[PDB]
Design an enzyme around this catalytic site. Structure first.
Site, mmCIF file in Angstrom:
data_model
loop_
_atom_site.group_PDB
_atom_site.id
_atom_site.type_symbol
_atom_site.label_atom_id
_atom_site.label_comp_id
_atom_site.label_asym_id
_atom_site.label_seq_id
_atom_site.Cartn_x
_atom_site.Cartn_y
_atom_site.Cartn_z
ATOM 1 N N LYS B 48 0.829 -1.232 0.000
ATOM 2 C CA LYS B 48 0.000 0.000 0.000
ATOM 3 C C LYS B 48 0.850 1.262 0.000
ATOM 4 O O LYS B 48 0.421 2.283 -0.483
ATOM 5 C CB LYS B 48 -0.964 0.027 1.167
ATOM 6 N N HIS B 176 0.927 -2.932 15.141
ATOM 7 C CA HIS B 176 1.562 -1.835 14.458
ATOM 8 C C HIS B 176 1.487 -0.606 15.401
ATOM 9 O O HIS B 176 0.412 -0.212 15.822
ATOM 10 C CB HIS B 176 0.882 -1.569 13.083
ATOM 11 N N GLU B 252 6.154 -5.791 8.776
ATOM 12 C CA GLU B 252 5.383 -5.290 7.625
ATOM 13 C C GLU B 252 5.874 -3.872 7.214
ATOM 14 O O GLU B 252 5.111 -2.914 7.280
ATOM 15 C CB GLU B 252 3.903 -5.246 8.014
HETATM 16 C C1 LIG Z 1 0.447 1.371 7.380
HETATM 17 O O1 LIG Z 1 -0.117 2.123 8.220
HETATM 18 C C2 LIG Z 1 0.719 -0.154 7.687
HETATM 19 C C3 LIG Z 1 1.972 -0.725 7.427
HETATM 20 C C4 LIG Z 1 3.182 0.009 6.846
HETATM 21 O O2 LIG Z 1 3.530 1.138 7.688
HETATM 22 P P1 LIG Z 1 4.888 1.899 7.464
HETATM 23 O O3 LIG Z 1 4.834 2.375 5.912
HETATM 24 O O4 LIG Z 1 6.120 0.950 7.630
HETATM 25 O O5 LIG Z 1 4.964 3.088 8.349
HETATM 26 C C5 LIG Z 1 2.162 -2.070 7.745
HETATM 27 N N1 LIG Z 1 1.202 -2.809 8.258
HETATM 28 C C6 LIG Z 1 -0.018 -2.324 8.486
HETATM 29 C C7 LIG Z 1 -1.123 -3.223 9.093
HETATM 30 C C8 LIG Z 1 -0.277 -0.979 8.213
HETATM 31 O O6 LIG Z 1 -1.515 -0.525 8.479
#
Ligand SMILES: *C(=O)c1c(COP(=O)(O)O)cnc(C)c1O
Ligand SMILES: Cc1ncc(COP(=O)(O)O)c(C=O)c1O
Lengths: 371, 372
Positions: B48, B176, B252
Site C-alpha cells: 500500500k 503496528h 510489515e
Molecule cells: C500502514 O499504516 C501499515 C503498514 C506500513 O507502515 P509503514 O509504511 O512501515 O509506516 C504495515 N502494516 C499495516 C497493518 C499498516 O496498516
C-alpha cells in the site's frame, strides 16, 4: 430512493462494489430552478466538482455552460460535444501548454490575478479575453480560497494597467467567496467590490461587460422546496449592475452536483466492544468520503433494511476500509444495530465525492447506476 | 541526482508532466541493510505504501515477502509471479469477497482483531492461518492506528478462545505502533505485550510460532549510514521476549523501503510576487503526489535543478499546488533562490505514500516515471 436502491440490489444480487445512484432528472429540475432563482445569471458548471459524463451531457443539453480548470477538463467537455465557446478557463494559474491548447481549441475566456499570468497570455494566448479575479472572502464558507487566489484591493489598478500595456482585453471581474457558503452578505459585499474594480477597468481604458459571481452556493432544500442566497445576490446585482449591457455569469459546482447522486456502501466488518458498535464499510475517506476530512462532513446513512418504529438505536462508529486511523466516516452516530452484509446509502453525495477517489490500499472502486 | 534529473530533462526536451525518478538499486541496497539490521526478521513489504511494479519486482527478486491489504494488492503481487506462500493478508477487516479471492489465490495467512472476523474466516476461508493483531501505540508516531485496529488487552483471551471454539488456527501475534515511528521504546513495550498474548494463545491450546512487529520504521540516514537507534532496541526486545529459534519473526515495513526509492520532479507553471513574498504554482499538488503535507504534516524543501551562484540571495517563497483549493499548499514558507516559470525542482525521498495517493481532481494528477 430507498425503493430504487433496494430494486437495484435485487436486480444485481451479485453487486459487490460500493455504487453511486445518479439521476439526470434531479439536475434538469435544478437547472429549471436556477433559471427562476437567477434569471440574469448564466451558469458555467464547475466541472471539477463532478465530471460524470452523463451529468456533463445533461447540462450541455439544457444550455448550461462550463467552468474548466485544466486542459483535461476542457477535453472532457469538448468530447461531450459542447462548443469551446461555452467554456471559461476560470483558473488563474494555467500552464503554458494548457494555454496553447486552449487557444487552438477555442477556449478564449480565462481568469487571472497576477502580472506573470498576463505575460503568459501575451506570449501564448494574446487574444484570450481576460476576467480579473479579485479576493473577496466569506469567513464562514466551509472551504477557504482567499490566500491562494484573487487580487488584493491595492493591486487591482496595477494589474488592469499592465494588461492594457500588453494589449490584453479585460472584459470582466470575478470572485469566489469560498466553497460551501451560506452567507448572503459575503456575496453582496463582493458584488459591490466588483463594481469598484469594474470602474477602475473603465478608468484604465478597458470596456468590461462581465460580472462573474463564482461558486459556493448550496441547493438547500427544506420541505421539498429550494431556499431563496438568490434573493440577496439579485438585490446586489440590481444595486450595482442594473444595466442590461452587462452579462452576469456564475461558476456553481455544488449547487448542481450535490443532489445528483446517492452513495450505497456495504457493512463488510463489525466489532462490538463494551456497548460500542464499530462497523467497517467497503468505502473510505480515500474513496468517496474525502468530504469528511476536507469539509468536516458528518454524514448519517440511510439503512436499506426495514426496522420497526421502536428499534433500539445503539452508539455506532463508521470506519472506512483502509489501514489508516484517520479514515473514519463518522466517529459517533446513533443507529439501529447493523450486520455484516447490510447495505446503507448516503443521500446527496454528488459534490466533491467521486472526483476525489484514490486507489490507496487497492480500494476505491465503485459502480455507477443511472436513474 | 541533480545531474541525473537534468540528464532526464535534456534527453526528454518535450517533458511536461511532473515525474518520479525511481531507483531499484537504492531499494536493493536497503534490503541488504535490512538483513544486517534485522538478521532474524523477514520483511513482508507493505505494498500500500508504493505499488510501483518495478519496485515490487525488485523486492520479489531479492526474496522479500509481501503484506497485502486487499484483493487488488494480492493480484498485483501474484501477477509478478510471487508465490502465495510469501503473502500475508495483514488487514484485520477483509470483505467476504476478498477472503474468497485470497482462498482461490492461496493467500492462507491473515490478521484479525474481532470475533465477527473469525465468523467470516470460519464460513469462507476456514483453512486460513490467523494472526491476532493487538493494540500497542506509539503516541509520537506521525500516523495513528490504534483507535481503529488491534485487540485491547481485556479481549485477547476471549478472541483466542473464540478462534479455538471455531477450530481456527492462531499461529501468531502482530501489532503496528503507528506509521512513521521514531520511538524505540514503543516497540520494546509492544514486543513484551506480544509475548504475553503469545503465552495466552498457548494457554488456550493454540501453537503459535509467529511474531509480526508490523511497520512504522524510517530508513533514517546520516552521512551515508543507516541509524540503528530503532533496530538495536527492537533486537534487544526480541532477545528478551522471543529468543527461541522456533519462533519466526516477520515485519510489515512500507516506508523503510519506499521512502528513498523515488524523487519527484515538478515544474514552476505560475508565479506571483507581492510585497516581497514570492508565490509559485507547480504542476503538482496535495491532491497529486503531495498528500503527505496534509496527512503527515510534511514540510518539504525542493532542490533546484538550475545552478545558482554560492552567494545568490534567498527570498521568502510560498509553494502552491496546481488545484483551485486553498488547502492545496505544498510549503507555506520556505527560503529559496528566486524561481521562474519553467524552472524544474525536485523533492528528495518522495516514494512513500506519494504516488499511491494521487487523484485526478481538477483534471490534474498525471505524472511520468523514469527508472534509474
Ligand atoms: C500502514 O499504516 C501499515 C503498514 C506500513 O507502515 P509503514 O509504511 O512501515 O509506516 C504495515 N502494516 C499495516 C497493518 C499498516 O496498516
Ligand atoms: C474558481 C472556482 N469556481 C467555482 C468553484 C465551485 O465551487 P462550489 O462547488 O462551492 O460552487 C470553485 C471551487 O472551489 C472554484 O475554485
Amino acid at each position: 430512493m430507498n425503493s430504487v436502491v433496494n430494486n437495484i440490489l435485487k436486480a444485481h444480487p451479485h453487486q459487490t462494489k460500493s455504487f453511486y445512484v445518479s439521476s439526470p432528472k434531479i439536475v434538469e429540475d435544478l437547472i429549471d430552478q436556477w433559471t427562476i432563482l437567477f434569471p440574469r445569471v448564466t451558469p458555467h458548471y464547475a466541472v471539477k466538482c463532478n465530471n460524470d459524463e452523463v451529468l456533463l451531457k445533461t447540462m450541455c443539453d439544457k444550455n448550461v455552460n462550463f467552468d474548466c480548470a485544466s486542459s483535461s477538463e476542457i477535453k472532457k467537455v469538448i468530447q461531450i460535444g459542447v462548443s469551446p465557446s461555452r467554456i471559461i478557463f476560470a483558473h488563474t494559474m494555467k500552464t503554458i501548454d494548457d494555454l496553447i491548447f486552449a487557444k487552438d481549441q477555442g477556449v478564449d475566456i480565462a481568469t487571472f490575478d497576477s502580472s506573470f499570468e498576463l505575460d503568459k497570455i501575451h506570449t501564448y494566448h494574446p487574444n484570450c479575453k481576460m476576467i480579473l479575479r479579485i479576493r473577496c472572502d466569506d469567513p464562514n464558507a466551509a472551504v477557504q480560497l482567499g490566500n491562494k487566489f484573487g487580487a488584493n484591493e491595492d493591486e487591482i489598478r496595477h494589474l488592469l494597467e499592465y494588461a492594457k500595456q500588453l494589449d490584453i482585453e479585460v472584459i470582466g471581474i470575478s470572485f469566489h467567496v469560498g466553497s460551501g457558503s451560506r452567507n448572503p452578505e459575503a456575496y453582496y459585499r463582493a458584488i459591490k467590490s466588483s463594481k469598484e474594480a469594474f470602474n477602475e477597468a473603465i478608468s484604465v481604458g478597458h470596456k468590461p461587460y462581465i460580472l462573474d459571481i463564482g461558486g459556493g452556493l448550496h441547493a438547500d432544500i427544506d420541505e421539498g422546496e429550494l431556499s431563496t442566497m438568490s434573493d440577496y445576490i439579485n438585490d446586489a446585482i440590481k444595486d450595482f449592475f442594473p444595466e442590461d449591457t452587462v452579462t452576469i455569469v456564475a461558476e456553481p459546482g455544488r449547487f448542481f452536483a450535490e443532489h445528483y447522486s446517492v452513495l450505497a456502501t456495504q457493512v463488510i466488518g463489525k466489532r462490538v466492544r463494551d456497548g460500542l458498535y464499530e462497523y467497517f464499510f467497503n468505502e473510505s475517506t480515500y474513496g468517496g468520503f474525502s468530504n469528511v476530512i476536507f469539509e468536516k462532513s458528518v454524514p448519517t446513512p440511510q439503512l436499506l433494511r426495514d426496522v420497526p418504529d421502536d428499534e433500539e438505536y445503539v452508539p455506532s462508529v463508521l470506519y472506512g476500509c483502509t489501514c489508516d486511523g484517520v479514515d473514519v466516516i463518522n466517529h459517533n452516530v446513533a443507529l439501529p444495530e447493523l450486520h455484516i452484509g447490510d447495505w446503507v446509502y448516503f443521500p446527496s453525495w454528488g459534490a466533491y465525492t467521486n472526483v476525489l477517489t484514490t486507489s490507496f490500499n487497492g480500494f476505491g472502486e465503485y459502480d455507477v447506476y443511472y436513474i
